[PDB]
Structure formats: C-alpha cells, structure tokens
Design a protein around this ligand. Structure first.
Ligand SMILES: CC(=O)N[C@H]1[C@H]([C@H](O)[C@H](O)CO)O[C@@](O)(C(=O)O)C[C@@H]1O
Ligand SMILES: CC(=O)N[C@H]1[C@H]([C@H](O)[C@H](O)CO)O[C@@](O)(C(=O)O)C[C@@H]1O
Ligand SMILES: CC(=O)N[C@H]1[C@H]([C@H](O)[C@H](O)CO)O[C@@](O)(C(=O)O)C[C@@H]1O
Ligand SMILES: *[C@@H]1O[C@H](CO)[C@@H](O)[C@H](O)[C@H]1NC(C)=O
Ligand SMILES: *[C@@H]1O[C@H](CO)[C@@H](O)[C@H](O)[C@H]1NC(C)=O
Ligand SMILES: *[C@@H]1O[C@H](CO)[C@@H](O)[C@H](O)[C@H]1NC(C)=O
Ligand SMILES: *[C@@H]1O[C@H](CO)[C@@H](O)[C@H](O)[C@H]1NC(C)=O
Ligand SMILES: *[C@@H]1O[C@H](CO)[C@@H](O)[C@H](O)[C@H]1NC(C)=O
Ligand SMILES: *[C@@H]1O[C@H](CO)[C@@H](O)[C@H](O)[C@H]1NC(C)=O
Ligand SMILES: *[C@@H]1O[C@H](CO)[C@@H](O)[C@H](O)[C@H]1NC(C)=O
Ligand SMILES: *[C@@H]1O[C@H](CO)[C@@H](O)[C@H](O)[C@H]1NC(C)=O
Ligand SMILES: *[C@@H]1O[C@H](CO)[C@@H](O)[C@H](O)[C@H]1NC(C)=O
Ligand SMILES: *[C@@H]1O[C@H](CO)[C@@H](O)[C@H](O)[C@H]1NC(C)=O
Ligand SMILES: *[C@@H]1O[C@H](CO)[C@@H](O)[C@H](O)[C@H]1NC(C)=O
Ligand SMILES: *[C@@H]1O[C@H](CO)[C@@H](O)[C@H](O)[C@H]1NC(C)=O
Lengths: 170, 316, 317, 169, 316, 171
C-alpha cells in the first residue's frame, strides 16, 4: 500500500533473488544478471528485529493463586474473582489482536518504503543519463558495460562522464 | 540496454492480519501466542516440596500423612488433589486465607507453646488418626476430664510471643456426636471457650449432635487460628471441648504455591505453572490456561496471532 | 497551451473528528462508534423466558403464595422484578446473593421429595402472613410443632441421601419467636439446639426469641439456610424444636442468564445485551448507555461520542 | 499531512466530482472536462471498509451480574466491585479514544497517499512529453485531443508517439 | 552556484525508544511519568478535618480523644496512624465497611435516640475512659443493674427513624472478664440481646472470660452498627450486658477520605493523595505510589518514559 | 527512516541553524548564507504540540480507598484487592510503554516527512532551470543573485524567466 512500489509500480517480486531483500537486475551488451543490495536489505532486517526484541521479553510480575481448583472458594467471592479474571482476558485479547494488526501494517509499509528509497537514490545517481521507464526500470541512454553497471550498484559512478554522450541520444 | 531494481518473493508465503485487510500474504511470519505445554512441573534449581497426601493446612496440626512435613522449607510448594488436611473429621475457619498465607511462607518453623497441665488427661486419641493403633494430631492435645463423666475444671492458659516475627497460633473446638457423649468426655452443663489478644476478640460454644460418619466418626473438630504479633499475648479461657495447641508456628521466609496434577522434573526450568504443567516460552501471550500463576505470558482467547517478519509477498 | 490536472473530491458540509495530532479536523464522511440508543423493552424473541413478577427468585425455592406458579420453572432467560418478594412470613436468607447468583444461571429447577416422615408432633403449622384462602405456609416447607401448646419437643434426627447424578440444593429454616414464652407455647421449653452436617459442611444453630418490629403483622422471623449436597453424600438434621423442615430438595435444570429489569417483555425484537432499562441492540464496539449491562455487550465507555473517519480530509474553497 | 498532496500541493478538492474520490480535469482544444479514476478510488474505499469490518464485530463474551440494583450487596464487597468496575471503565475509555485517534491519523494519511500514487503513475506515463506544473498540473508540450486525453486516463498511451514533437517545444 | 535545504541539529540530544529501535537520539524530549512528590497534604480551598488521635470510628461512639469530633463537617477527611477508635478495649464488627461509609459522608450530624430508663443505673464508667476521673463513651450509655448482683429486668426500647435519609444506629455488647463479674454487673443466668428492623435480623449472647489486659482491662466491648431506613423502626430486646446508643448519626453530604503521615498545607492545591503526600502533576502517569487515591495519573512500573518532542538528531 | 531524507539523502543536520527546524543554505556570486523556513517549521511544531495537548490532560475519575495501610483488612479480600491492583498495574505499564513508542515512531516520521515535502516544493518551483544533486542540493543552471535566491525562499520566483538561459547550459 503506502509508498506505492511493492505491489505497486513494480509488477511483482523475484523468486530468483535468494541473496537479499532488494536487488538489481541488469541488461546490457554482455547478457543479463542480478544482485542483492546489502545496505537497504540490512536496514529493513535491522528494523524488523527491532520490533521482535521489543515483543519477546520478560514480565517480572509474579502472580499467585486467589482461587482454588480442588476445594472451590465461597461462591460470592468466587464469582467476583471469575468476573475480574474474565474482564482481564477481554482486555489482553483486545490488546494482543490490536498490537499485531498495528505492527503488521507498519512492517509491510516500512518494507515498501525501503524499496522506494532504493529507487530514489539510483534515479539520482543517474541525473539526466537515464529515464524512468515506469515499471521500476531505468532506461540508460548510453552503453554501460558490466563494469559500469557495478559502478551504479556499488555507488561510485560519475554521471558527467556519460552526460555529453547520453544527453545527445535523448 | 537498461537497469531494474526489485525485491524478493517466495512461492509459499504465510498470511496475517493487518489494520486494513484480513489474510494478506507476507514473505515470513512468526507466532506470538504460546500453545505448547510441558506436562511436568519444571523445578530445576528450586527447593521443592511436594505435599503428596499431606494437606497444606495439615502441615500445621499434624495428622499422620503430614508427619514428615511439620517443619518444611521451600522456594516452591506443590499441593495435590489426593492431599487431606485432616484425620479426625473437621474443617478450618477462613481456610483459604490460611492456605494463601502458608503457600508464600517459604515454609514453617515450630516451637513449643510450653503448656503444662494438672487436674486432667492429656492423651485422648482416636482410630481415625492411626499411627500404629489410635493416636492424634501431632501438634495438638486432646483435652479430657480425668475419667468418664468427671467434671472439667475451669482453666486459663496463656502464651506470650517472645520472637521478632508474628506467630501462627491454632486450636480446636470439639463437637461430640451426642450431648451424652459431650458428657462422658468433658462432663456436664454447657461449655464456654474464649480467646483474646491485643488484636482479636472472639468466643466459642460446642454443638453436639449427629453428623453423618466420616472415617467412622459422627463427631467433628472445628479448627481456628490467629496471627499473634511480637510481644502480644494470647489467652485461652475454657471449660471443656477444647483441643489445645502444643506448638506455635513461624514463617521461614518467601515461596510460591501451586496446585498440580503432574510429575516433578528437575531437568527443566520455568516460572509459569498451572495444574497441567509448565509453560516455558518467551512469547508475550498464551492460550494454554487462564489460571496459570508465576511469571507468565498474558492469557488471551485467540489460538493464534501471527506477527509479520518480512515484506508483502508478490509472486507471478 | 493545453494541460491535464488530477484532484480529489470534496463536499460543502463535512464532519469533524479527532486525530493523534489535531482536534476537530474536517473529513469527507464519518461514522459513530459509541452506541447511545436504547430499546426500552426486554427483547426476548426466540428465548424461553420467565418473568417472575411478584415472585422473588429465592421464593422460587421455599414457596410462598406469590411463587406457586414458579416452583418448577424452566428458562433460558430469567427476569427479576422490583415488586418481587422472596417471603410471606418475615425473614431472610443467609448468603442470599450467592444463592441468587446460582439460581440465575441454573436454567431453572426441578423439585423432588426429601421423603421426610413424622411421628410424635404436628406438621401443619400455618400463619395469616401466608394466605392461600385463609392461613397457610411455605409450599416447599413444613412448620414443625409440638403436639399442642406447650408440649415438649422430642429430640429428632432426619437424614436425606442425594441419590442423583448432580448436586442437590437443600434448604431449611430457623424460627425466632417474638417471645421466649411464645417459643414455649410452640416448641416447649429449655434452650434449643439445631445441628446440620454433611461430608462437606459442618454448622450449628440456636434460636433467638425477642421483639422485632412487626412486618406483615409479625414480630417473629424465619432465618433460611442452604447448602449444596454432592451426589452420594448425606445431610442430617439433628433438632429439638424451632425448626422449619424442607419438604422437597431442588436440582438445577441446565444453563441460563439472569437479569433485573424495569420494562416490558417483547418477543418481536432480539438481543443479547440487557440492563434494567432495556436492551442494547447494536453492532458497535462501545456504549454509553449503562455501565451495569450484562449479556454479550459492547464495552461501556465514558464518552458520549467518538467519530471514526470514513473518508479523506475535506478541502473546499 | 504525511504525503504532502491533499491539503498540500493540491490547492483544494472538487465539489464538482461526485463520481469517485480521485479524478482528472483536462483542458484542450475542444473545451474543459473531468472524470473519476476507478482504480485509485476503489483502493481507498476497499481499505477503509477493511478497517470498518475489523471494528464492527462480535464479543462472544458473556458476563453476568455480580451485583444487585434492588437489594444492595454488603458494602465491603460492594465497594471492591465498584472500584473494579470503575478501573475497567478507565481502561476501555482510554482504549476507545486512542483507537479512534490512531485510525483517524491513518485513514487521512492513506487517502493522501492514494492521491500521491495516482500523480506519480501519470508523471511516469508522460516521460518527457510534459512538465510538472507544481500545483498538481501536467503541462503537455504537444496538442492532445479528447481521444488522446482519455488514453492517459485509461492507461494506454504511447509516449514516444509525441516524443519527437514534444521534446522540440 | 547552488541552493541546498537541510534541517537543524544539536550537539547534545536526548534518547528515547521507538517501535523499532531502543535508544535513538532526538533533538528534544519530555517526561511522561511523574517522580516528584510534595511531602505535605495540599489542602488549599478545601474544608479539612485532621482526626489526629481520634479514630474515624471513635467519631461515632465518643471516646475522650474524639470529643471535639462528635459532629464534624468536611470535604476532606485525614486519618492518622496514632488515631484510636476506642478507650475501653474492643472492636467494631464490619469495621472497614463502616470506615468506608464514614470517609465519604462529608461528616456527621448527631440526634438523640430519646431513650429513657427506669429500674436500673445509667452511669457506669471506667478508668480506661478518663475525662477527669472515670467516664465513658460520650454517645453511649453503660447499662447496669441497681447495685451489685441485683437482677436485670427484661427491657425493650425502640426508635423510629423519622427523617428523610437513612440513620446510622450503633450499640455494644459487653464481655466481662469473669462470669462472676458478669454477675456483679448485670446479675445472673445467661443473657440474650436481639436486634431487628424491617431489614435486618440478628442476635447476641455475651462471652465472659480472661483476655489479656489492655488499658488495664480484661474485659471487652463488641460494637455493632446498622443502617436504619427512613420510616423503618429498630428495636432492642435485652436482659443485661448491653451498651445502649444515646444518639443516632446522619450523614451530612459528600467527602473523600485519606490516610497520611505528613503535615497539612493550605498553601498548595491538589487532588491526588497518598500517605506520603500529594502528587501535583499534569502528566498521564506516576511511579510514586500505587495506592494513591483521589484524581491521579495512572500508576506504572517504569521510572521513566520519554516522549519525543523534536526530530531525529543527526550531527557530524 | 520512513521518508528517506533525515538521516537519509541529507548527510546530517545543521547546528548552525538556530532559527527554525528547516532551512536553506545558498552559494552564489556574493558569498554563502542560510535561513529558516517558517511554514514547514510551523507545521512540524503545531503537529507535535497537538500530540502533547492530547496526552497532558485531566482524569476527572475519582477513586477511593478499598484497602487499609494502618489496620490491614482481612486476608482473603486483601489478596483479591492486591491481585486486582497488580493486574491494572500490568495493564497501564503496557499501555504507557506502547503509547510512547508508537508516538515516537510517528513523531520522527512526521518530521522526516516535513523535510521531504519542503524539498519537493522547491524542485517544483525550479522546473527545468536546475538539477537534483542527490545530497539535497539544487544545482542552478544559471546565475541567481542574493535577491533571486530569496525569491525561491519566499515562493515568488518565475521559472520561465531563466528558462531560455538555463536550458541552454544543460548543453
Ligand atoms: C474418648 C476419646 O478420647 N475419644 C474417642 C472417640 C470420641 O468419643 C468421639 O469421636 C466423640 O463423640 O471415639 C472413638 C474412636 O475415635 O475410635 C474412641 C475414642 O477414644
Ligand atoms: C401457632 C403457629 O404455629 N403459628 C401462629 C403464629 C406464631 O405463633 C408466631 O409467629 C410466633 O411468634 O401467630 C399467629 C398468626 O397470626 O399467624 C397464629 C399462627 O397460627
Ligand atoms: C462498675 C462498672 O460498671 N465498671 C467497672 C469496671 C468493670 O467492672 C470491668 O471492666 C468489667 O469486667 O472495672 C473497674 C475499673 O477499674 O474501671 C471499675 C469500673 O467502674
Ligand atoms: C469460576 O471459574 C471456574 C472456571 O475458571 C469455574 O470452573 C468455577 O465454577 C467458577 N466459579 C463459580 C463460583 O461459578
Ligand atoms: C521466519 O521467521 C523466523 C522468525 O523471524 C526466522 O528465524 C526465520 O528466519 C524465518 N524463516 C526464513 C525462511 O527466513
Ligand atoms: C492417659 O493418662 C492417664 C493419666 O493422665 C493414665 O492414667 C492413663 O493410663 C493414660 N491412658 C492411656 C490409654 O494410655
Ligand atoms: C518487645 O519487648 C522487649 C522488652 O523486653 C523489647 O526489648 C523489644 O524491643 C520489644 N519490641 C517490640 C517491637 O515491641
Ligand atoms: C458515510 O458513512 C457510512 C459508513 O461508511 C456510509 O454507509 C455512508 O455511505 C457515508 N455517507 C456518504 C454520503 O457517503
Ligand atoms: C393439625 O394436625 C393435628 C394432628 O397433627 C390435628 O389434630 C389438627 O386438627 C390439625 N390442626 C389444624 C388447625 O387443622
Ligand atoms: C455413587 O455410588 C454408587 C454405588 O452404589 C455408584 O454406582 C455410583 O457410581 C456413584 N455415583 C457417583 C456420581 O459417583
Ligand atoms: C456502587 O455503585 C452504584 C452506582 O453504580 C451505587 O448506586 C452504589 O451505592 C455503589 N455501592 C456502594 C456499596 O456504595
Ligand atoms: C524541550 O521540550 C519541552 C516540551 O516541548 C519544551 O517546553 C522545551 O521548549 C524544549 N526545549 C528546547 C530547548 O527546545
Ligand atoms: C449513679 O446512679 C445511682 C442511682 O441512679 C446513684 O445512686 C449513684 O450515686 C450514681 N453512681 C455513681 C457511681 O455516681
Ligand atoms: C414516611 O411516612 C410519612 C407518613 O407520615 C410520609 O408522609 C412520608 O412520605 C414517608 N416517606 C416515604 C419515603 O414514603
Ligand atoms: C497487599 O499489598 C500491600 C502492598 O501493596 C502489602 O504490604 C500487603 O500485606 C498485601 N496484603 C496482603 C493481605 O497480603
């Protein structure tokens, strides 16, 4: 949903990609290929584990019996105890279902968001030497070889070094 | 020639709920509600006392079942369905209050009241408390009159609590099957039994008559207790029908009490217990037993509540 | 030159709501979340209903004239009324509310004789506080006398075994006469003892004669007592006068739900959330009608109102 | 707020548009006009009703009386009952006000978000044949007739078919 | 030449928790859990009554400590550890229920029962209740028999509640140290005391015998109480051992009761109170005292929970 | 995190900027300089104070004692009271820690979001007369003097008045 990329302007995911959460697929002279982006992948993962540690923890709060399975306590106090216990079951089931729904919405959205951020950074590396396809593709208006491709991937790519050339073809 | 970014997917996702949609498929999820019980009492590292046949309250009066538990010591106390507080039939007043105090006492330490007697018998026993042949509550004294139908001569006995902590004082009223039985025992006329401290005033008359018989007995003992503060004194004015405390009790420290139907196991550890075992888990919630006690995940209604641990799953 | 522009909708009259961040922001559409509307009737459609009217729930067990038509009722839903009374000759039940809570959820009751049988006394003691046509008495109970005034009352024992699969509700009464001299004319002389035991329950009773203000023209009182007898267990009654004996024992039929209401039954509407002023029919998660409502109910809250947005921010010119 | 469009770079909404939640207004040779986008509109609506179904549901949890309006129970237990009942009233009123505020923040933001997504997709259909005005308008650097306009609307519009022409201007 | 936008920062941020990360640094934050107590009872603007040595329940029976409080009026009632309900030793039945009623009564208004007596003494006093020399509960009457060992002649006394609200009726049973003392006082034979309304049936026998002595007394008084409805009548049938109410009590309005160990202070205002003072605060939560009463922030376990009030803090 | 700007494509913040939350730094002929944006800054601040007012408020709910610090009530009812009180302590500590974490995530994200919105609006003022640097900078493809700079800042800047000139230099 929220950031409009995953299950958005990207058609679908890649069963192919078993190496990370987000990646690049390239198409040049020397063939096709793919690879995982570590920085974005790590940021999603680190954030999700953040959630997990917050939820799998330790009550240090002891409770004891107020009640008795073997010799029932007196009815009046019995029924006050059960009514209280049932009210708390109502509270905790409500909290639990709500927490999980809430966190799930956010998990999904922060994953979508992380993909969108990765897109953005690349669009920006390629100032003017490419166009947005619209399906999550960058059409490169020059030739760019495997080595050049990896220069985008590993964030050391000079744009004004194909500028004259690429601006020409657009 | 072009560059395209994307994200992962899998053929088989897990589906979860969100604020906005029910059953959406994500790459990976994890459970949040514990369903798995261990059917043993995981007691590793903890001083444990399993009362078996002894009832917790029996720990204080001393029927044959409890002889080995008159001075126990524990971090963890286990009560059993088979357990019984009593040999000669009767009840405790405010019995559950008492159980709750004893469950968290870390055990008990006995000490003589130093009561001493003249002008009566001390040795009254019964075939409902058999050791080998007729006996009686180990911590208690069945107070009679010299033989059959003799008079019971008005008595007073007092005990000061000279220790730093509060004392658990206990005692008994005997209700004989007949009025004529009340007679053969403690003589004649109606009988009064009073009890005071600086803290506590109350008073007792016996009630002879037929009850259905229980361990072959139509009679009953009413047990009573109070907490005597340090330096305070309790005194017992009585004229028959009275079951005197031989020893007072003091609480050792701190513990936790459970009621269980399963075996002890010193090979596993946990702090969340219920009658069918131990809930060992990190998870925030559980659907195993809403009456679990200890340090426990919160009980909830749902069998299951999956937490997403991956992105939305989009295949072809 | 010529262009394309996207936008979104709006309306002249929006509804305003609260957010995390701002109070009173206007959205295109909203919906209520807290129920305010009550139905002033007990919506009882589809349910076996019993409205006690003048009979008190507890009178259901002892049997005063008001309750004659309710000695063996059957219900999914039980309705208690303000006008209802448990009693004809003045008295009380011990642990009376515990009892009401048991009876409210019993699905009704099924009576069965104790089979007590008597010799050496009268059985027929009645009173003008319990009128059928002329002086009568608790239908399920027996006013136990001595042969005529001030005859002696000869020590008795009576026992009843519970031979059924479920637990029994056993009841009985202690009579406190207006005078000591009245205690006499009735059950003879000397002080009086009444004991009661099971495998489960030990307790004991002495009467207490003396003046009370009169209530249905009576200075005397009956103390009612009860216990739950387990299957196979036996209760026994040792007594020497001043005793009101149970004629019949009671058994619980099944399951039900008890309410206290001030309004009319209505078999035309259905619901499961009830309070003394009616039924709360609603899907909403919350309600501000009555915090003591019982049944299956939206959660009671303090707020009159809490609007949930069901559209976007409303931006007009 | 969050996505910066509704009550953002769009000035205001359209009372005119009674046909959906989001739409297009065009201006060409042959006059003015408007129309609703079904896909985006449906996505907002479907999500909101998602919320609604989740909140309008069914406790199956019965409670009974522990208390008595006609003959008051004993005071001590009475006051423990009232104190407990008041604590739960505190809990549920807090939950309720918080739920509704939370959901409202999100509802508003997901509507803003859906508008922003619609913008995006069109900017992208028109790669290079238009400029962002900045007020939510797309200035088309060629002539585009009613028929062409609807080609954008219904997402079947070839950009490189006005590319030579538009890049020129 | 170019234009660049950015955002602020600071060298020293405050760190907080998010859903997603623990200890992230933000430009500015604010506390959410109150830790600061004012060690005084902030009572400004409120009609306050500090009972000091008088026990709340003594307000009704009238021992010397309470003479100045027999008819008090308050918005705010303060109970002290030093306070005592009693001069001649004894207890109230359902004593805490009573305290809870009195704490919220806005005070009490007394009114004679108009009881009148013949055939007995009325003036029985004691050295545990000293005014100057032996006296007694101001609101109560120690009912005797004409002198030593005389008979006590069966009495009935009744009081109708002729007012618009319910009445607080109180009375006492005397348990003498001896049976022989019960005698010197109220004559002989066993003694009965009954009490009824349209609403309430119950009954009492005395219980003489030795208690440890408390203000030099082996005897005790059991105090009892009931709420008489408008137009209902209470009647007292009794034959000795009875401590009769001289006056009935009526509740004035509304108030709030606290138990405190600190000084009153009319210079500060608050509505959240506990035994160590007042919690003055706007914040939603507090970690000072889980038993605080009044209008209070919610008690929580955490010492601290910072709310961010600025952006992420990113320095060089 | 969420909007990718603060602690994102912007390297870091400006201790220099003591005048608002968001600002502009410019570089032209006549030197360097900076200044705060009031509109965006106000919007962040107003929203945060929104939160604060919602949390610092007034229970009007009175509670009284059901319990007794000087003369303990009876144990059974005592223990039911304590158990109930401890359950509520569990509920409120959970709510409190959750509320604060939740609000903190949102606070941080709405501040990130506000920066991103400011960026956007400027990119759009400068249609074609500039390029995105990528580090939060706008490379202006003409000369623009202090006075012109302030025209961007105060949102009255005509783009087609450097269009011919600027489009030229991108070749
Ligand atoms: C005399 C005595 O001390 N106790 C006796 C009791 C009691 O008389 C009744 O239980 C009370 O009525 O009955 C018997 C028994 O238990 O075997 C003999 C026993 O010695
Ligand atoms: C004899 C008997 O069993 N019941 C009688 C009672 C009781 O004597 C009193 O209630 C006891 O104080 O009084 C009368 C009445 O008007 O009902 C006559 C009735 O027959
Ligand atoms: C005469 C009377 O009514 N009360 C007297 C009491 C009581 O006899 C006992 O407390 C009851 O056992 O004892 C004395 C005393 O030292 O106070 C004298 C006092 O006047
Ligand atoms: C209270 O709850 C238990 C189940 O948790 C039930 O078995 C028991 O009978 C209930 N007590 C009463 C008095 O209804
Ligand atoms: C799914 O969930 C658990 C919890 O995060 C995790 O340990 C495991 O890696 C996940 N499974 C896969 C295949 O990643
Ligand atoms: C019990 O004690 C008495 C003396 O107190 C003694 O004479 C008697 O033999 C003892 N009885 C039994 C059965 O041991
Ligand atoms: C109890 O009394 C003794 C006097 O022998 C004294 O030493 C001790 O401190 C007292 N303590 C308390 C708590 O009363
Ligand atoms: C307003 O809200 C309700 C609930 O979503 C809906 O049924 C109704 O259509 C809405 N009103 C309008 C005018 O859309
Ligand atoms: C009641 O029963 C007795 C015998 O038990 C009988 O003689 C008498 O006539 C009956 N009394 C009344 C008032 O019917
Ligand atoms: C009661 O005892 C009888 C023996 O006659 C036995 O058949 C039956 O199973 C028992 N009933 C119950 C409910 O335990
Ligand atoms: C409990 O609250 C009700 C209002 O719900 C009130 O009318 C009643 O008197 C209160 N109970 C006690 C024991 O004060
Ligand atoms: C920090 O937080 C509080 C609450 O907003 C505020 O009153 C104060 O101005 C802030 N401090 C600074 C230095 O901005
Ligand atoms: C109390 O009253 C009696 C007579 O009513 C009187 O004679 C006597 O002097 C008084 N007793 C005392 C101790 O003052
Ligand atoms: C009490 O009785 C009197 C009759 O004198 C009457 O005027 C008043 O209304 C009664 N009070 C009530 C509550 O009925
Ligand atoms: C209940 O809690 C208090 C502390 O809150 C404790 O000191 C007290 O003894 C506890 N009550 C019982 C009956 O154990």
């Amino acid at each position: 949903g929220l950031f409009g990329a995953i299950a958005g302007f990207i058609e679908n995911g890649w069963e192919g990609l078993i190496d990370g959460w987000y990646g690049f697929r390239h198409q040049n002279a020397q063939g096709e290929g793919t690879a995982a982006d570590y920085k974005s992948t790590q940021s999603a993962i680190d954030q999700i584990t953040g959630k997990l540690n917050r939820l799998i923890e330790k009550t240090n709060q002891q409770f004891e019996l107020i009640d008795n399975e073997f010799t029932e306590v007196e009815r009046q106090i019995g029924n006050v105890i059960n009514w209280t216990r049932d009210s708390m079951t109502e509270v905790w089931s409500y909290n639990a279902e709500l927490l999980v729904a809430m966190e799930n919405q956010h998990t999904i959205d922060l994953a979508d968001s992380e993909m969108n951020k990765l897109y953005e950074r690349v669009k920006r590396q390629l100032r003017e030497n490419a166009e947005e396809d619209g399906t999550g593709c960058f059409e490169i208006f020059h030739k760019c070889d495997d080595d050049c491709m990896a220069s985008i991937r590993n964030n050391t790519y000079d744009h004004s070094k194909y500028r004259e050339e690429a601006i020409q073809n657009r | 020639d072009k560059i395209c970014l994307g994200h992962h997917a899998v053929s088989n996702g897990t589906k979860v709920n969100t604020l906005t949609e029910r059953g959406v498929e994500v790459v990976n999820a994890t459970e949040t509600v514990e369903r798995t019980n261990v059917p043993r009492i995981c007691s590793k590292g903890k001083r444990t006392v399993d009362l078996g046949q002894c009832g917790l309250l029996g720990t204080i009066t001393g029927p044959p079942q409890c002889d080995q538990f008159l001075e126990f010591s524990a971090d963890l106390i286990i009560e059993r369905r088979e357990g019984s507080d009593v040999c000669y039939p009767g009840k405790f007043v405010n019995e559950e209050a008492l159980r709750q105090i004893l469950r968290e006492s870390g055990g008990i330490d006995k000490e003589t009241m130093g009561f001493t007697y003249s002008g009566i018998r001390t040795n009254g026993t019964t075939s409902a408390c058999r050791r080998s042949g007729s006996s009686f509550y180990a911590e208690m004294k069945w107070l009679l009159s010299n033989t059959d139908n003799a008079a019971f001569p008005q008595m007073t006995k007092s005990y000061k609590n000279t220790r730093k902590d509060p004392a658990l004082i206990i005692w008994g009223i005997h209700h004989s099957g007949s009025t004529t039985e009340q007679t053969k025992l403690y003589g004649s006329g109606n009988k009064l039994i009073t009890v005071g401290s600086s803290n506590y005033q109350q008073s007792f008359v016996p009630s002879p008559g037929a009850r259905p018989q229980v361990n072959g007995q139509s009679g009953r003992i009413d047990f009573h207790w109070l907490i005597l503060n340090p330096n305070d004194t309790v005194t017992f004015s009585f004229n028959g029908a009275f079951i005197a405390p031989d020893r007072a009790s003091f609480l050792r420290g701190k513990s936790m009490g459970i009621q269980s139907e399963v075996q002890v196991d010193a090979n596993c550890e946990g702090d969340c217990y219920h009658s069918g075992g131990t809930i060992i888990s990190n998870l925030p919630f559980q659907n195993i037993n809403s009456r679990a006690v200890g340090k426990c995940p919160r009980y909830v209604k749902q069998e299951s509540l999956l937490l997403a641990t991956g992105m939305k799953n989009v295949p072809e």
